[PDB]
Amino acid sequence: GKLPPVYPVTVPFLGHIVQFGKNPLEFMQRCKRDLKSGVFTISIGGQRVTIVGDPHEHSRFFSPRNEILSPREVYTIMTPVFGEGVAYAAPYPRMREQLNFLAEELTIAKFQNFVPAIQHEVRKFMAENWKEDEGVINLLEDCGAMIINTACQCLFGEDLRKRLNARHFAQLLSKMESSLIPAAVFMPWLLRLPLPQSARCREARAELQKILGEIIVAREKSDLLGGLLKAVYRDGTRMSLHEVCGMIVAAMFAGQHTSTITTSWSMLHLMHPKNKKWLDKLHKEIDEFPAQLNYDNVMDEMPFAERCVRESIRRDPPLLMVMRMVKAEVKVGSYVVPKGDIIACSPLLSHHDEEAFPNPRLWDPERDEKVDGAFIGFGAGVHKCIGQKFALLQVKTILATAFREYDFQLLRDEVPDPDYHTMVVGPTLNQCLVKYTRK
Amino acid sequence: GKLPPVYPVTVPFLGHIVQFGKNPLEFMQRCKRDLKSGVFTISIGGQRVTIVGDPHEHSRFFSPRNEILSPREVYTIMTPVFGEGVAYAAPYPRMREQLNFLAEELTIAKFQNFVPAIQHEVRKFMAENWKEDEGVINLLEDCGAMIINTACQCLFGEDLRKRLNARHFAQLLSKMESSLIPAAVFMPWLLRLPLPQSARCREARAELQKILGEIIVAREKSDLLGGLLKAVYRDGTRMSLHEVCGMIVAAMFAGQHTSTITTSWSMLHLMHPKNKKWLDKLHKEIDEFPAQLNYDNVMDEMPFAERCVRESIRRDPPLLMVMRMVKAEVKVGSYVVPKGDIIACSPLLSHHDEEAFPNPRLWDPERDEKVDGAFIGFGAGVHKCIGQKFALLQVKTILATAFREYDFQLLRDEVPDPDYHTMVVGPTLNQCLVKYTRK
Numbered sequence: 001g002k003l004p005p006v007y008p009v010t011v012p013f014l015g016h017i018v019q020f021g022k023n024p025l026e027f028m029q030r031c032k033r034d035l036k037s038g039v040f041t042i043s044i045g046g047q048r049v050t051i052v053g054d055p056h057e058h059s060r061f062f063s064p065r066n067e068i069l070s071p072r073e074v075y076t077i078m079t080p081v082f083g084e085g086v087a088y089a090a091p092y093p094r095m096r097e098q099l100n101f102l103a104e105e106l107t108i109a110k111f112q113n114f115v116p117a118i119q120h121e122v123r124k125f126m127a128e129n130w131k132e133d134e135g136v137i138n139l140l141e142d143c144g145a146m147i148i149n150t151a152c153q154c155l156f157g158e159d160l161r162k163r164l165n166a167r168h169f170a171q172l173l174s175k176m177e178s179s180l181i182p183a184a185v186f187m188p189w190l191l192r193l194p195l196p197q198s199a200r201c202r203e204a205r206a207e208l209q210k211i212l213g214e215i216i217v218a219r220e221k222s223d224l225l226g227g228l229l230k231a232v233y234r235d236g237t238r239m240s241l242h243e244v245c246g247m248i249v250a251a252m253f254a255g256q257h258t259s260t261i262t263t264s265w266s267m268l269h270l271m272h273p274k275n276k277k278w279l280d281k282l283h284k285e286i287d288e289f290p291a292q293l294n295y296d297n298v299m300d301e302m303p304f305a306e307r308c309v310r311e312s313i314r315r316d317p318p319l320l321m322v323m324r325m326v327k328a329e330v331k332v333g334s335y336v337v338p339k340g341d342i343i344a345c346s347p348l349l350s351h352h353d354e355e356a357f358p359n360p361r362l363w364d365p366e367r368d369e370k371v372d373g374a375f376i377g378f379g380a381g382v383h384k385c386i387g388q389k390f391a392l393l394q395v396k397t398i399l400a401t402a403f404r405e406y407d408f409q410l411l412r413d414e415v416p417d418p419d420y421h422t423m424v425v426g427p428t429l430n431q432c433l434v435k436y437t438r439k
Numbered sequence: 440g441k442l443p444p445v446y447p448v449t450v451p452f453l454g455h456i457v458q459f460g461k462n463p464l465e466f467m468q469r470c471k472r473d474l475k476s477g478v479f480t481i482s483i484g485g486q487r488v489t490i491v492g493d494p495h496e497h498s499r500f501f502s503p504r505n506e507i508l509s510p511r512e513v514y515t516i517m518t519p520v521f522g523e524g525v526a527y528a529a530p531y532p533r534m535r536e537q538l539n540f541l542a543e544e545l546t547i548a549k550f551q552n553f554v555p556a557i558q559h560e561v562r563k564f565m566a567e568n569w570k571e572d573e574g575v576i577n578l579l580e581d582c583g584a585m586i587i588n589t590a591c592q593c594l595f596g597e598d599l600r601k602r603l604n605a606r607h608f609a610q611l612l613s614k615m616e617s618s619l620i621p622a623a624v625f626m627p628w629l630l631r632l633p634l635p636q637s638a639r640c641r642e643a644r645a646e647l648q649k650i651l652g653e654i655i656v657a658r659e660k661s662d663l664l665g666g667l668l669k670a671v672y673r674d675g676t677r678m679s680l681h682e683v684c685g686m687i688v689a690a691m692f693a694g695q696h697t698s699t700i701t702t703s704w705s706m707l708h709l710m711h712p713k714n715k716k717w718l719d720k721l722h723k724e725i726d727e728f729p730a731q732l733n734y735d736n737v738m739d740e741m742p743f744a745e746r747c748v749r750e751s752i753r754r755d756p757p758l759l760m761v762m763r764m765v766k767a768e769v770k771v772g773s774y775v776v777p778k779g780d781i782i783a784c785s786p787l788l789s790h791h792d793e794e795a796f797p798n799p800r801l802w803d804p805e806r807d808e809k810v811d812g813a814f815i816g817f818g819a820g821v822h823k824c825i826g827q828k829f830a831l832l833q834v835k836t837i838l839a840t841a842f843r844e845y846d847f848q849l850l851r852d853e854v855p856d857p858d859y860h861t862m863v864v865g866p867t868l869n870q871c872l873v874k875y876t877r878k
């Protein structure tokens with residue numbers, strides 16, 4: 001029945017956000033140490049944020065359903081991006097069905113042809129941008145382009161890509177991102193006020209929706225769009241085109257940076273001299289494969305590539321925190337978290353806990369969690385990442401294709417520092433220069 | 440450049456509405472006479488209402504497009520009934536397309552099978568409610584039920600009627616009507632405020648929309664619904680189900696009372712002793728026909744029934760006024776009507792003008808307008824009634840079927856007085872008792 005200890009209220013407005021941008025790990029470790037507790041509370045903009053910082057308590061955070069811990073209220077910022085009535089802006093039961101419908105479309109049973117479609121786009125991109133025997137590139141910009149290109153080949157039909165290509169898509173998604181006020185998570189009063197950038201992203205989304213309508217009419221005269229319009233709710237009705245447009249935008253938005261960042265970190269580690277052992281170990285795994293790879297190879301026959309990916313996400317999780325609004329009080333350890341808190345779990349913090357991942361700064365693909373449930377890079381339980389399998393697939397295929405055909409050398413002594421200022425954390429951009437060399 | 444004369448401002452709030460409910464014709468005639476002008480203005484709730492009361496000026500009222508005289512703003516009351524984004528609540532160009540799409544569905548080319556489907560429902564209703572050799576009924580209640588029953592057979596598919604029958608439909612439409620504040624036409628400030636009855640009609644419409652969704656999914660696994668979902672806008676997109684649900688509700692709403700009232704008046708006149716000449720004349724026309732009538736009979740071979748219907752609408756038009764918001768000043772006669780007026784034309788007033796219809800109180804199906812364009816019972820120009828042909832069809836078929844098989848006697852000396860208190864004016868309810876006699 002104890003309230004968690006409270007790191008007492010600071011004066012600068014949203015001042016803890018500045019600390020989360022500079023040294024989030026060290027900050028949350030200091031709170032843990034100095035309050036002598038794995039569960040503690042900070043105040044951000046008058047909003048109590050209770051951080052669950054002990055991996056043994058993960059199940060208490062990820063288990064409860066929306067009737068008790070709800071993410072809807074924390075992601076009010078995305079409502080102009082995905083649309084009213086879509087995903088988290090929808091009532092709990094319609095929301096639940098919508099997410100499941102998108103998940104049905106990203107199950108491993110749907111990746112027939114994805115590996116080739118991906119390998120083809122990767123090969124295309126390397127042909128168009130990495131022409132020389134040798135050259136310098138920014139790995140992070142380049143993986144980004146590969147991720148959106150590959151996503152579009154796998155997911156969109158030939159007629160859709162003709163009308164709206166991957167470069168126009170990345171732009172829309174990048175423009176929408178830039179309209180967000182990530183700190184408004186702690187300023188719900190602000191989101192009740194008219195914002196002009198909200199209307200602009202609504203107008204942009206309307207134009208995309210008009211394009212998807214024109215295509216459906218044309219088709220009516222199997223890809224992601226076509227799959228979602230086949231969906232039937234339990235009440236026997238279909239998703240509206242509005243709702244479908246919305247879920248497509250959520251799909252793409254989610255993956256743009258996280259998968260980019262994950263591909264990039266994984267490559268940055270593999271190419272580093274200090275990790276020649278793992279690179280040789282990856283080559284022993286993938287040199288076995290035919291040129292034109294297949295679903296079976298990447299999915300079923302790449303366990304060690306998967307580890308390299310996992311540990312990159314372990315060491316440098318792209319989403320630093322996972323958050324809910326407590327709609328009814330919840331037990332955590334010896335504490336009770338009261339109604340109205342934001343309750344948060346931190347993959348960064350739990351991935352750097354010395355008990356769960358001894359020597360946490362060391363990238364080591366052959367480690368395993370010493371605390372069961374501690375790895376939460378793709379979340380857990382009810383709200384577990386539904387794109388995990390696609391993202392792994394994309395990223396593994398890109399790793400194999402790229403490393404089979406080129407070597408890479410980082411143009412700096414140590415692996416990039418993560419840059420924590422951004423919504424999705426990745427390696428610092430101007431530290432990602434890389435020399436490539438065709439084999 | 441003259442402003443029309445202004446009937447100067449009265450004090451009781453919305454007090455002229457009370458006069459429009461008791462003696463609208465006499466009131467507008469007094470304004471015309473006493474201001475010595477066919478074009479004059481009254482003030483209702485601070486809103487200037489400029490009435491165009493000379494049939495020679497009809498073209499100046501009905502010709503201009505929405506960029507100049509707009510009905511959207513006057514029918515803000517219907518937005519909870521038909522939905523946001525639907526009909527008049529839609530932007531002028533989408534609105535224009537929507538109305539046309541409904542009109543495409545009610546062209547004479549679509550009435551294959553309508554005459555039988557109608558005659559079958561009429562025969563059914565007479566079998567179930569007029570069983571005796573002789574009995575008493577309220578004609579107005581009974582035509583009402585026939586109009587909605589027939590409409591549903593003609594317009595809805597077998598699978599739709601199974602799931603939502605004509606009695607549940609009439610109820611929904613009657614509940615929605617009863618949520619309206621017809622005087623809020625002159626109280627636009629009121630419609631900007633939350634009204635609880637607005638939410639209730641939105642909830643009821645959602646339930647209808649869910650039903651139409653369930654059916655489309657079932658079908659996907661030719662009637663009005665099916666026709667509208669085939670529609671393609673100029674930009675190559677489809678109407679949403681929301682929009683389609685809305686237009687169906689507008690379709691049905693429009694016809695419930697107007698067609699009922701028109702059938703009822705026409706019968707009330709025909710059955711009256713004073714009009715035996717016209718009844719015999721109708722019989723000479725329809726006794727020629729086979730029992731199971733057809734499209735060709737009613738459409739192509741009933742000119743005199745049509746006249747009887749027209750003159751009933753001439754004498755007692757169901758919609759007393761037609762209205763627009765002046766969005767840019769317009770010339771009318773020697774006057775100019777300024778931006779921001781409601782400009783109105785009155786079928787009642789123009790149908791009772793002695794120059795246009797000499798001896799206007801006399802029902803006489805063999806008269807013709809002495810002023811070209813004076814008959815406006817179904818409007819004119821751009822906003823001409825798009826259900827006119829269906830309504831005539833329904834009403835003619837009901838007249839033939841009913842009069843071939845029964846005689847009728849009104850249980851009172853004179854034809855009913857119209858009751859002007861209602862939104863759609865018809866004959867006074869408790870004056871419509873009628874004795875029927877099977878032939």
Ligand SMILES: Cc1ccc(Cl)cc1N1CCN(c2ccc(C(=O)N[C@H](Cc3c[nH]c4ccccc34)C(=O)Nc3ccncc3)c(F)c2)CC1
Pocket residue numbers: 016017020049075078182183185250253254255258319320321322323342343344385422423424
């Ligand atoms: C500073 C701080 C201190 C303490 C605490 Cl408890 C919290 C904070 N932050 C709260 C605000 N932050 C962020 C950071 C990143 C995001 C973010 O990129 N979202 C997008 C859009 C999105 C939000 N939901 C979703 C659910 C499904 C799909 C997309 C979204 C995103 O692609 N997500 C993402 C991607 C992939 N699979 C899951 C989620 C943010 F919405 C707030 C960081 C700091």
Ligand SMILES: Cc1ccc(Cl)cc1N1CCN(c2ccc(C(=O)N[C@H](Cc3c[nH]c4ccccc34)C(=O)Nc3ccncc3)c(F)c2)CC1
Pocket residue numbers: 455456459488514517621622624689692693694697758759760761762781782783824861862863
């Ligand atoms: C007292 C007064 C004095 C002076 C002046 Cl200028 C005006 C007024 N009135 C203004 C308010 N009144 C009314 C009377 C009746 C209606 C009415 O039943 N509408 C329904 C719903 C509706 C409105 N638009 C439509 C357009 C298309 C389809 C439906 C609607 C109606 O089925 N329509 C109707 C039926 C058939 N085909 C055309 C219109 C009203 F909406 C206000 C009368 C007095």
Ligand code: HEM
Pocket residue numbers: 071099102250251252254255258259262313318319322323376377378379380382383384385386387388390391
């Ligand atoms: C490396 C790539 C990705 C990472 C690291 C990642 C990480 C996560 C995490 C941590 C969560 C849990 C958040 C929480 O509990 O609040 C999550 C949820 C989610 N992710 Fe991702 N994600 C990735 C890619 C994707 C992709 C490609 C999609 C594409 C659709 C996606 C869609 C989602 C959705 C919908 C959820 C929420 C499910 C729900 O709330 O029911 N993610 N992701």
Ligand code: HEM
Pocket residue numbers: 510538541689690691693694697698701752757758761762815816817818819821822823824825826827829830
């Ligand atoms: C006796 C039956 C009917 C009468 C007397 C009648 C009368 C009228 C009148 C006078 C107008 C013109 C209003 C104006 O200019 O503002 C009109 C318009 C209209 N009526 Fe009717 N109507 C009847 C039946 C129907 C039916 C069955 C429908 C079914 C859909 C319908 C739909 C409409 C529509 C949509 C318009 C407006 C068109 C536009 O604004 O573009 N009406 N009607």
